[PDB]
A and B are shown apart, each in its own frame.
Chain A
């Protein structure tokens, strides 16, 4: 792109070789405020960007009416990183460009476990999870190997992104409003790490934030 100037601590570190992966940023909870943080760390040839929806919205005005376009982006790596944008712009290309920014901010990692057969690398979600936006709520159920992605084409996409290849699913409520279904499905795949399991606990040690360690070089950064 055009030449870039970080206004973020993280941004500086990422432009240097200090933070070299998403993991570091995630592990000590910090918000991503610049999409350029994603592009630098995760190289292109792993990232994919699809537009799940583009639709007109209308706002009422006396006589003629102004119009706009909502759209969704979806983004991520098949290595277990996903992130869903949605944004609004008064023209087509506007809302498109805007979506992809927001999407790369909202990126979250994915835990994949097993069904109770352990071979290779994860093919299955570690547990049942649910996510809800509007009246729709999705129930992701873990499936045995070779099941394939058993869901509708709308979530099939969203699951392919997140590296889940074996699942069984069902939805509830009004599912024929597209937008609500997307957000729902995504909140599901978050909830994995949000749930405490015996395998994880051992009172795993914490250490200093990248920010703190690199404080000196951020001071120098400011200059």
Chain B
């Protein structure tokens, strides 16, 4: 950003977590528009995402949700179990609205409907199957931020965070980092301590 003291920069323990829970990898298939994000290819054929790139995307999306002073106008959406849990725990803290399970059409466009809402901003776990959401963000003038599989298209995604959406431990990490840093910039939790509660709360468990 600047002027600034190298603030909100990747660190030892940050990296240590990401590598471990395997969100540094992508999906195996080569991209259709995310070619730049990919850093090489392994001898398992899985495309590694660059760490520096991902990190800056995350800080960016923090600046977005920091600029909404009524967090309830931002939406979170999953259609996948692995992100389901992490949504609920996030909407407690950051105070965002959400719909999870499945997106329902006409929640952002159909007037006669009691599930009607007008977001300022929208998030998604996967732009591929949350797609209905995105196409109703388009016509209401709502920007988007998504957690993009490398394979995934970027259609109707304004800003994109490269991600692995396969498995629980991948997705939980990303929501946890966002939520952390967001609360560090609003309500001023210091970055001096390690953050208060665990990533294990954001893991899907089954009831």
Contact = CB atoms under 8 A, between A and B. Distances in A.
A79 interface: no
Contacts of B158: none
A8 B118 contact: yes
B129 interface: no
A185 B49 CA distance: 51
B141 interface: yes
Given A7-B111, A8-B118, A211-B120, A31 B70 contact: no
Contacts of B139: 31
A218 B69 CA distance: 12
B69 A215 contact: yes
A151 to B, nearest CB: 33
B73 interface: yes
Residue of B116, B139, B141 most packed against chain A (CB within 10 A): B141
Nearest to B112: A7
A215 B119 CA distance: 12
B15 interface: no
A216 interface: yes
A29 B116 CA distance: 20
Contacts of B73: 215
A30 interface: yes
Residue of B116, B118, B139, B140 most packed against chain A (CB within 10 A): B118
A15 to B, nearest CB: 16
Contacts of A17: none
A33 interface: yes
Interface residues of A, number: 13
A219 interface: yes
A25 to B, nearest CB: 11
A9 interface: yes
A211 B118 CA distance: 11
B141 A219 contact: no
A216 B70 CA distance: 8
Contact of A31 (B69, B116, B120, B140): B140
Contacts of B120: 211-212
Residue of A212, A216, A218 most packed against chain B (CB within 10 A): A212
B75 to A, nearest CB: 15
Interface in A3-31: 7-9, 29-31
A22 to B, nearest CB: 16
Interface in B115-141: 116, 118, 120, 139-141
A161 to B, nearest CB: 26
Nearest to B118: A9
A29 B118 contact: no
B70 A7 contact: no
Nearest to A9: B118
Nearest to A28: B141
Contacts of B118: 8-9
Interface in B136-158: 139-141
Nearest to A34: B111
Given A30-B141, A31-B139, A31-B140, A219 B70 contact: yes
A118 B88 CA distance: 62
A220 to B, nearest CB: 11
Interface in B68-94: 69-70, 73
Given A9-B118, A29-B141, A215-B73, 13 more contacts: A7-B116, A8-B118, A30-B141, A31-B139, A31-B140, A31-B141, A33-B111, A211-B120, A212-B120, A215-B70, A216-B69, A218-B70, A219-B70
17 contacts: A7-B111, A7-B116, A8-B118, A9-B118, A29-B141, A30-B141, A31-B139, A31-B141, A33-B111, A211-B120, A212-B120, A215-B69, A215-B70, A215-B73, A216-B69, A218-B70, A219-B70
